[model samples]
Target: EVRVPATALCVFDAHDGEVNAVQFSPGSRLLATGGMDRRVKLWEVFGAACEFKGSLSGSNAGITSIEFDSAGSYLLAASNDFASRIWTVDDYRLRHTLTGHSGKVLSAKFLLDNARIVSGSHDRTLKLWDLRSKVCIKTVFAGSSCNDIVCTEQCVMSGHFDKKIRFWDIRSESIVREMELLGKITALDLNPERTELLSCSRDDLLKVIDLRTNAIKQTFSAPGFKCGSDWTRVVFSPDGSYVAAGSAEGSLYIWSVLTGKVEKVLSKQHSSSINAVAWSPSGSHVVSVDKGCKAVLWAQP
Candidate 1:
């Protein structure tokens, strides 16, 4: 029922350096961005000029990823400095510091309950952190460096530099299954219905995998499209009908989930490589950030 926007609603000058991550609150009231500047900035999204809410700072290096808890009360960030930090959303105060990864943390997210956090790192391990106790409770030794991770109530899914997608059983803490791809997996996201998985890779293809059958349902690609970064991110629309990703050519591409076709391509929107793309929870807007330090919001026309 949602349509792609014809043009950007507003392009904000978002960061001092390369913008690495962008995510919207579950309620769609706010947007959070992290950058090579080592800060996480919050913005109110109701006005034509998105008002800057506040900034969270503590990381010693650039932030590689940022995400909000289910209730939007807290924010989590993974950084190049080999740690993950949690911040209270209301006051922008540091809540917890998760520091056990031996290498750069690439991605981190709150589980469905918001009581725990899972992070994937270049250290070739995935760690589960207990939010209440502020300590790591489990670690899974993945064979290769993990670039991204997604989770369901029962399982944790991770993508790796070895071109594999692995699913781990939470209770058993063992890998249940793994599927191989042609190129290194850079990002992963689950559809709103939770029946399918979308994966973007350096192979220049966006693949739709059927979770029930563990098979690829569709593949989307364009000739010039290239993965933008080691941590390049992609996301599913809130409605689960489309997938959006950033290209190394400074373009944003949206693909139809059902048909496996490119539905829209917003090009030349950034002067440098686009690093991340996020769709608002309401499905009314799409946000993308680039290495040129820009973030643009595309709205329904």
Candidate 2:
């Protein structure tokens, strides 16, 4: 019932510099990407066809992460500029510029309800900002630098440079739990259904965390699949049946969630290391953006 594309359908000259993040809209209709170019661009991909939409600007430096809210009405981006910008996807208007983190805002996400925002920072704190007021009203002292974060209805989970995953309460802004991991945690993002988590780290393995228990249910890796950067990302196939990640060896690694086996190892595409992998919500495509300026869209071939 689910299929994963293997070949590079086509490639987009995504940016002039390193692309830090690439994500598709919730409906899988469009994509948003940001990078060291200090700009976020939108794209439309259909049956391997592409139409570059435009770009968004407000942050001053490299983008650390990019995510589209569930409704796809707003695009949220974290930046090295110590702020996260929320833009209206309809017309690419810079709506809110959340600026309170003392250090780089490493990750940010919209709560499923889209009423509030949760962000983690190198400042060693997690802040909750109200969408309407455009102000941070709560701050949780997380004790160590945060590298990435994901959200649930009532809680927010953050992966830390200290090798810990701290769960925070949405309303209280207090930590709920802290789980440790091997090596520094790079990204801790949830699957579409939010029942499983796909996390990547310098440990050189991708682990799936069962949200119901907060324990690793599976591990994934390919031979010589070294991590590319501190901000590298791993993502779940839209159906949550597979895990995909890019390697320092410039190969794209995909593994079956149920088989516990490496399904595909597609190398020789990106000459530079791949830094991020984003799966479209509809299984229409998967985009792998590298440390260099390439973003390849993979569809059934």
Candidate 3:
């Protein structure tokens, strides 16, 4: 149902410093980006111009990650300032500042219901925050510094510097399953159906795990696909047919999930290393950002 483009539709210089993270709203009408400039910017992506809407300010350090809630009414950001923050999407106002981690917060995401937040940090722990109270409700002491996390209704899955993926039961606050990887994990994402998990690592490989069997299903790799930073990210297409990632050499790579083969490679798109890639919710657009403060938009022909 979705088509991949042969070339980029537009490339914009989106920030003053390295663009660390980019995400599309649930409806694909708005795009949010965080950068090394220590700010988050909102953009209107539905039109040809890709107009800049507003910026969210509060974090003193570079932002590591950003996410929109299910309803697209709220946005969450993880920062190098040892905290995660929430904002209202409509007014671009800061609603909550979650501070507790001893080290930098690496990743933050909304739970299935969007009433609570889950965050991973270099403090070697995962914390759950209650939106209603603006306070941390529970903390899980992960054995290593957590780099990324994904949450399902059943459990919380986190990838860490210890080169392991851990699945934790929410109610009991205990790890139910743990699997080791060849290298430290940098990012993680779940497919649309939540049947599979895609994990990117510093070892220059991406592994797809079968959630049901808790086994490695497929591996994706390239010759020089080094992860540029701890926040370098990978994402699954909205349709769940493709996997896309950015490399240290400023290239964008797309692979076919079923065949485990490289489908497209866009190289030298930025002057510096790429940090993140995101597919629009409608599956009609793709966005990639790099250390050069550039953001490129791709469209199907």
Candidate 4:
């Protein structure tokens, strides 16, 4: 196998099961991964080698996604088991197991407060749950299988399998913005200012949506990334200067978000569908996870 330079690559195989999702904390002190083994593991990366710090292994169904609260005090995992779980990182104990979604949970994310969570699921709805009370706060129907959901200070953005993105007012349960697109909406991210939304599709396209005008800004194609395969995971760096995408060919590509230009391509690092992509808080490093059950780390010179 051809090896990429260590300056731009640090590959780690950290899971026995297919890694479904991976996330880095805001402080870059911890990396969390979830997999088909029904396990969520935390890795402590001092330099290059990542040692297992701990594992939260109790979900009966494989974890679909994981996220850390803004404070990094708690970690949340959503699973096909129809539940979203919260864990206190300090104790590593399962704090709460929230159940209400009618079908498999696809994605979950923390609100700014860390006391509340928003989740999307195959149930065709997005639900909000309160952690302290461990109760379902509200459920908003998204009109299709909600693949991914995210929140900013202003609104909650949800992408559905039916190729539509819906934006809702966070303070109230009202639909403020909505747009239809091509192909299944697999993943999405909001700009730091929440003025723009980015989405990846099953059609081998990455599209930018302008929140201010509620219109499509631009679309870029990744033909080599494959359309039918799971090349849809995409995320923007913390500074919103760069955007990265992971494809079914185990390829990772970084782009200039401002110019819509491909900047770097880390190809063939993974063997299967690149299921997730995350940027460390500092924006200096990136991590990609794949269905082949591995996590690869990348850094820029």
Candidate 5:
């Protein structure tokens, strides 16, 4: 592992537009970032500095979400162009492209088993695809434009632009329950154990939802943040002790999981809206990517 504060760091200066998402490899040895410029870059993050690994090109629309498989062998990219693609991480070769959504594909992910993938789109639908056949296996007509999605052992959780969240049963292929919020949800992340869920929205509030009871366990509001300044993303530490959020004002907040209280406020790391935040697999670091072409790393310390 590298020393505290990172004696050296590497920045990729390849994208022509803002970076939308950044994710570390499962082992925390590599970093990946995608941008509005249709660029996907990979970097090695070991020692004191990061090294440019490679890049892949093909997306005509800006990337909205990016995720790697559990083993980090493949990468999934969702874009505003209504398509989600699967690519081999080693060569960045396109393995398959998922299309069906009439609007932007907001988020896509490979299920734990890696046999199937799920995607949420602005077309107001969520789809499950079979990897081997590369065909859509099932579709759920969720309400207005789904922004984010999370898959659990028992349910598929989806958040929409219309201030609605729903839980669907994978085996039944139906929405079992739904929860309504006051604002549009922009992001949702489940706890390490997949027992609790955290969501952030345009309402400038962070909410914790318990999966077992399907109830609001707690809520944290940031009045200091302006409305429409979208608190768009939320993540939980591996131990579930902390919940972190990224706001449109480009500010980050780390909060106590037990009390739902703010533990730390991290700001000035980005010049524009923060679009995504991811906690490293090791839970030792958190990374935030912004629309300003900036990516910042925070150590747990």
Candidate 6:
């Protein structure tokens, strides 16, 4: 049986204004939170408690997404400042600033190589950034703004405002395949095996697409579970046995992949809208951040 996190271990204000993204490092206890307050903060979790690590400051506008490289060596952020910034996890200092987008950058993600990164922006282009040179070496015209992106070793999966999910060929710099959802796509996640793709959309649904078949397998939704923002994100549990996302009502919803059922929903704490939810790498905790500046930690009771 798959375990679902239903207990709110702790809840606290993580930012001043709207919190946009929450992500845990690859293999650590560190959690990163970014917000419309134009700040990114790191928290170190121990058991049910958390301690603020330090603030990363380089963004000129609101942060839209956050990511940790596969090695957990660096943390990256996409911002409305029209740039994607990277920081070293060793010291939490700004490392590189990528500025090629003419519009707000929404998503920055690391490819399998870790030596390279991909960023998607409202400028309708996906740019590949090389960590060695800190330069955008290649660009792909996406035709629409991308809100979120995830990558495999050979291709990029980008979620767009045009209600499209496009798969890009990294080597060829062109779209290989495209899929459409009912509403604007907000976020995307690929399971560890890269066989299943998870998507969140403003249409008030979360879908899992089977990469092997290039079609959706199942969709998860619930009552009062409106998407809080165009940037609302959903993720597959670390083990890929469950799908976890936060609703506009600030409730955490975990759906069983095998049973195709709502395994758990925790709504007693949040009084505001949830923007993003992330399950930890250890598979023992889940963290959610909201527009009300609250960051709640969850675990199995």
Task: State every prediction's TM-score relative to the real structure.
Answer: 0.97, 0.97, 0.97, 0.93, 0.91, 0.97
220-286 per-residue lDDT for model 3 (tens digits): 9988678898768999999889999988988888999989999888875677888999999897688
Q: Name the runs in model 1 displaced over 4 angstroms.
A: none
Q: What is the per-residue lDDT of model 2 for residues 64-163, given as tens digits with 9 covering 90 to 100?
A: 8998887888899999999999999989899999999999999998887768888899999989889987789788788799999999887788998988
User: What's the ranking of the predictions by lDDT, best on top?
Assistant: 3, 1, 6, 2, 4, 5
Per-model lDDT: 0.89, 0.87, 0.90, 0.80, 0.77, 0.89
lDDT of 6 by residue, 85-152 (tens): 99987797998999989999999998888588899999999998898986888888897999999998
Give lDDT tens digits, candidate 1, residues 1-301.
Answer: 7677557878888999999999999898999999999999999987344778999989988998888888889999999899999999989999888999999999997887658899999999999999889789999899899999998887789999999999998778899999999999999999987788999888888898999999999998987779878778999898888889989988899888888788889986788888999998887689999998899888765
Q: Give the TM-score of candidate 5.
A: 0.91
Stretches > 4 Å off in candidate 6? none
Model 5 spans > 4 angstroms off: 1-14, 226-231
Task: Tell me the spans in candidate 4 whose CA falls farther than 4 Å from its real position.
Answer: 1-8, 227-231
The 10-residue segment with the lowest total lDDT in model 2: 167-176
Which run of 10 residues does model 5 get worst, by summed lDDT?
A: 1-10
Candidate 2 Cα outliers beyond 4 Å, as residue runs: none
Off by over 4 Å in 3: none
lDDT of 4 at 128: 87
User: Clashes in each model (backbone N, CA, C under 3 Å)?
Assistant: 0, 0, 0, 0, 0, 0
